[PDB]
Design an enzyme around this catalytic site. Structure first.
Site, mmCIF file in Angstrom:
data_model
loop_
_atom_site.group_PDB
_atom_site.id
_atom_site.type_symbol
_atom_site.label_atom_id
_atom_site.label_comp_id
_atom_site.label_asym_id
_atom_site.label_seq_id
_atom_site.Cartn_x
_atom_site.Cartn_y
_atom_site.Cartn_z
ATOM 1 N N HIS A 169 2.748 -7.571 -4.661
ATOM 2 C CA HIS A 169 3.651 -8.310 -5.529
ATOM 3 C C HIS A 169 3.009 -9.629 -5.942
ATOM 4 C CE1 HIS A 169 7.850 -6.317 -4.704
ATOM 5 N NE2 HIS A 169 7.076 -5.602 -5.501
ATOM 6 N N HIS A 174 9.980 -2.556 1.441
ATOM 7 C CA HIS A 174 9.899 -3.617 0.441
ATOM 8 C C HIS A 174 9.113 -3.146 -0.777
ATOM 9 C CE1 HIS A 174 10.181 -7.665 -1.057
ATOM 10 N NE2 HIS A 174 8.870 -7.828 -1.071
ATOM 11 N N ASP A 231 3.975 -12.791 -5.959
ATOM 12 C CA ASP A 231 4.076 -13.974 -5.113
ATOM 13 C C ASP A 231 3.222 -13.885 -3.855
ATOM 14 O OD1 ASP A 231 5.826 -11.895 -4.352
ATOM 15 O OD2 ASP A 231 7.007 -13.277 -3.121
ATOM 16 N N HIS A 232 2.459 -12.805 -3.680
ATOM 17 C CA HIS A 232 1.562 -12.680 -2.534
ATOM 18 C C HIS A 232 0.210 -12.064 -2.862
ATOM 19 C CE1 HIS A 232 4.841 -13.826 0.149
ATOM 20 N NE2 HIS A 232 5.605 -12.981 -0.518
ATOM 21 N N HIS A 241 6.482 -14.615 4.059
ATOM 22 C CA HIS A 241 7.315 -15.797 3.915
ATOM 23 C C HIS A 241 7.566 -16.386 5.291
ATOM 24 C CE1 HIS A 241 8.233 -15.588 -0.370
ATOM 25 N NE2 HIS A 241 8.334 -14.278 -0.234
ATOM 26 N N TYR A 301 17.841 -4.309 -4.336
ATOM 27 C CA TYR A 301 17.469 -2.915 -4.526
ATOM 28 C C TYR A 301 18.702 -2.018 -4.535
ATOM 29 C CZ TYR A 301 12.616 -4.233 -3.397
ATOM 30 O OH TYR A 301 11.364 -4.802 -3.389
ATOM 31 N N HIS A 346 1.536 -6.491 0.655
ATOM 32 C CA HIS A 346 2.071 -5.718 -0.456
ATOM 33 C C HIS A 346 1.585 -6.345 -1.755
ATOM 34 C CE1 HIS A 346 4.855 -9.045 -0.218
ATOM 35 N NE2 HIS A 346 5.472 -8.672 -1.324
#
Lengths: 263, 263, 263, 263
Positions: B83, B157, B85-86, B222, B188, B81
């Site tokens: 985002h 997500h 942090d990735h 994660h 969410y 995805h």
């Protein structure tokens, strides 16, 4: 561990909101006391020049409502350069107003990647990306509601720095307004820069471009650069500089910084 | 004045570098102890799945050099995805390696605006924008050096969350690896969300999609989500969950959070 | 030598201009006799659904002027799918009207590359590229001047095919209008398509989606698909089909074409 | 009805394939007899300058295979200008080779919209859009496998026309190669053009830029412009012009066309 991400921290005066300050019959300063955001009200919509910090989107819309300008009345957004402290809320303003963004090719490609991969700052100063809707050439005229805006390229601060000139009125009598970008090189490597090989040549030509601008009243994205003081209201333009004085003082500092770099 | 811009602050373990940890004959964990960045070495180049934080670009290139993978050997970048942090260092990795980025339409449009205008987070978590070079459909197969990667859509997500499955070897005998995105909804609004009207339906279908995935070994962006522990080296996959246990535990939390939201 | 480039040639009836035909109190057909281009006039601007061939930009603006709709009054452009025979003049309409384009992720990525690299047609049918300004999710509501438009995803003809539903009036009494995309697969490879692996599953689900649509009056991008006849004026909707009859007839042809492909 | 869409029809010699013609120790002409497509083979990959017509993608890959250059060995694509007859197959070459495209801001924005909305040609000459991966500044050096390419801006034919210079060898002894774009204005409005206000100033400066180029051997996108004849093989460069003769003849025609426009 690796260092945490550090955000863009500025002075408290850059984020100090102010009421709409009148510049001419149709030109208004609706930004903050240390950031210029010009609103031009025409008969067929409104035009906005720059916006400031990304978090100033709500403040800009409130001052537009004070002038009787609905969100759907904003027709066009003009940019001096695509840095975060002046093109920040452009992406959010497009969604909430339905306006279009006009810029040259260099400003369009920098705005499309949110100021990232900057020639001098890298990824240190970023902001939400926005896409330009109309590509502008050097000397092209943009007309909104009978008010003609002429773009003047002045590369240096950014490769796509653009000065905008237009003629307004001051109780009937006309006045030539010039909104020129910064002519400074804050911490730039001036000589032998791989990312900007002809940086010195573009600064020298931009100094001459600003001098020849048709201008009775000069404004800059930072008010202190042109000796404006938005805090004193009516006497804001009392000490404002001319195009010659603004360019002459910029070239004197550029020559000094270029000399210190040699050493 | 207006509030200063606040950056994305994470835990110190997300930025704790680690040496390449072997997962299979060609799959390696080259990220950090709390962020998964998989490297698949083939005969005709290398493939990278996710990258982590934006500042992890240099760390990823160092581990690739430890495996004998030159920057110009990275051929493709796959994303779970988009985002921060990735998918943080994706933009910088494209410039320094010459690789291509494959993603679906939802991940491509979110990656193109640097995670800004997020459906739930807004502009709070941004990163340098990157453009996808190949658009991927649900179930499409991507082949690099004889290793086939199959994309499995699992929206929730993010609208473009994608699970990647491929078959590797463990000293000759084959092993099915599944890299599935997170199935959590951190903060969410699940019911009546204007930005995501069919959010509940996509989560329910994604739970079933993860259960049916062909998988002998499951990994998540994660490591704690799939009970991996990169710090203990060889015994990292000792307590790893199955696709059923990972989806069953995710649906139980989703039902509880959905019930608390009603109250 | 190599073969010359061949353009998209259509029938003469697709380019036969017609006067604005009234559908409801605010819905008007302003396209041609064989191409649907709907104009919805509200109190706070106008909304356009599809446009037709790329060369129909001038014809659409003339009919808008006949309805008293200035170019700057067009606020939004909605799309069923991003093919040349229906999203052609979108790029030119954005420049000459200042409107915004709303579409989902799949329609946005296909519109951004001008219909090139099509999953079934390749580069054979292209048109000037346009960028979407607002990304739309399944079931999201778009409101313009008090008229609510609801998007319904129906993938098949294109991965981003979208049906739009809204409630209008017919001399006071309300009427539910549904503008659904085509449900046909003209020359598509239905089974084992590498570019669209789950093509059959998306068509089956889209057939059911069209049946459940809230609709008192159905319109399609091609008028013959829903048994409309724009040439007879007032009796245009006399033989118009229902959502069930339109989907039932589409599924019967899809099953037959799927059976012939097996042979 | 409205007029049918008309495609870009060229001469039969522009689509006449030819075998790889050697220019230097590493420079090869792999296009057609009337379209220049240069291949530079280095130790760390290959570089391609221009491509020709959009349908020449397969022909370019076949000549690369004749030189022992695999598709994954193409590392970079350089462009003179982003018109269809020279940047046509760029989009398809990116998908099938995994290479990157380097161009300046003006060429990047024109390539991103597939040559549509041209300043002089409008939408008459379009091609599949492609996105640039690296933005190039004037005078910037691009290094691939030890061979340095220097970009020289020469606006006129298009606002982003760029000349590329690099030093090769001819059996040991070095040779300076210059690949300059066209200096012609075919049917352009030279005086008072609203889309290009400073067109005359850019042509005059580009004439001087071409004269000062370091060049022992000049090549142009059209071979006849520099008096090349690819059909005679070894004696192709027998009558090739110099940078002065190429610029002097271009300025003489520009002055004549500018004089006829006045009348």
């Amino acid at each position: 561990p690796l260092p945490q991400l550090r955000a863009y921290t500025v002075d408290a005066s850059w984020l100090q909101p102010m009421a709409p300050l009148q510049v001419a019959d149709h030109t208004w300063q609706i930004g903050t006391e240390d950031l210029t955001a010009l609103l031009v009200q025409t008969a067929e919509g409104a035009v906005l020049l720059d916006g400031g910090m990304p978090q100033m989107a709500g403040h800009l819309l409130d001052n537009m409502k004070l002038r009787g300008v609905a969100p759907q009345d904003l027709r066009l957004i003009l940019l001096s350069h695509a840095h975060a402290d002046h093109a920040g809320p452009v992406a959010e303003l497009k969604r909430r107003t339905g306006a279009h963004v006009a810029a040259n090719a260099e400003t369009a490609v920098l705005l499309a990647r949110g100021g990232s991969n900057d020639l001098h700052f890298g990824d240190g100063i970023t902001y939400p990306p926005a896409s330009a809707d109309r590509i502008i050439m050097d000397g092209e005229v943009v007309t909104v509601g009978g008010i003609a805006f002429t773009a003047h390229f002045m590369p240096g601060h950014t490769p796509g720095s653009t000065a905008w000139t237009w003629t307004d009125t001051r109780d009937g009598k006309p006045v030539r307004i010039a909104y020129a970008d910064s002519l400074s090189a804050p911490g730039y490597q001036l000589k032998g820069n791989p990312r900007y090989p002809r940086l010195i040549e573009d600064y020298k030509r931009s100094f001459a471009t600003v001098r020849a601008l048709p201008c009775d009243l000069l404004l800059t994205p930072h008010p202190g650069a042109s000796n404006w003081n938005y805090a004193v209201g009516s006497k804001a333009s009392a000490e404002a500089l001319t195009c010659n004085a603004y360019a002459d003082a910029a070239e004197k500092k550029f020559d000094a910084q270029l000399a210190r770099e040699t050493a």
